[PDB]
Amino acid sequence: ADTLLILGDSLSAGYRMSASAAWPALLNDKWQSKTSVVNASISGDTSQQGLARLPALLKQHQPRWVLVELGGNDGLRGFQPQQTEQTLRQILQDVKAANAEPLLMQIRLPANYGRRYNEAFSAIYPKLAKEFDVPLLPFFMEEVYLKPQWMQDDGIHPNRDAQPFIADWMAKQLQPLV
Template identity: 45%
Template sequence: MTTAALGSAGLWANAAQAQAQAPTSNTAAASSAGKPVILVLGDSLSAEYGLKRGEGWVPLLEKRLAQQKVAASVVNASISGDTSSGGRARFPALLTQHKPGYVVVELGANDALRGLPLTDTENNLLQITKAAKAAGAKVLIVGIQVPPNYGGDYTRRFEAVFSKVASATQSALVPFLLKGVADAPDAMTLFQADRIHPTAAAQPQLLDNVWPELRKLLPK
């Protein structure tokens, strides 16, 4: 998340302290549909934090799949406040339960909020990706960026984590989930009152950022 629209480190701390929420989609319906499963492993940016159910980019993805007649179902296993280590810990059970053909990994923002070592974030994302691929799934890494008050060096190194994992595992990459939102001229209007989580109006842009790379992985 770059740009002054996201405010200070104190605002980031608010997000880090957000109460964890359960995954938001009907996983039973998705896994029983007989279609390849897209598993979204994310944090509050994918868990519809502060939004009405159905407004987030992940439910919008389900609608787009139906509109474009793509044979795939979506399981949203995102939890607000989750870190890369949390995602790594719960991922094996998700693999066993849902047997996804595609895994979208959107984690790391809360690692930065909590000041966790970048080497740990990189290793966690690497192990998640390797486990997914070992299970036969195709992986899309979704990158995030931190506010400029973290300093230029940290900002660059954090951003590079996602591309390094994608390159090392030959996975697809979305460089910045909030492109066109956090760096938009009217960015302030596209975020909730906490100035961290995008509004419902911004969710289609998040989907548009993810969709091109995800579509390349899906059945034709």
């Protein structure tokens, strides 16, 4: 029984819903008796808070793959993309050293954050992915934005109704990678 560890934030932990309602739990359901999905995501977690938890998780879960979904809160709070990039790099190193396969998810900020900043934030992902030669999954939120009925009031977080769809899309994206 191989393990996929998910190191992410509210987008993966679920926002204003229980963990059982978030897509990782639904993905774990359809990957029943196949692959184990461990959702180690916490709402509001910056890339540093995530990195802070990683060591213990690798040690305890001995995952074959780690899906990294972090940075969104940093950019959202105007952090220094140079810093975020540095944190994500350590995360990838930790994963590799743990003899696990890192899977990086691309993150993008709202258009109302300025072109300058958004481009610098976004570029981090392709850059690290090239640097470590790891898969760079597209940003699943891009498809969700196209369906207002799948978005919560804040225009940021996907709602309960969106979870099964995100689970299916994620299963599709992760398939070749597992």
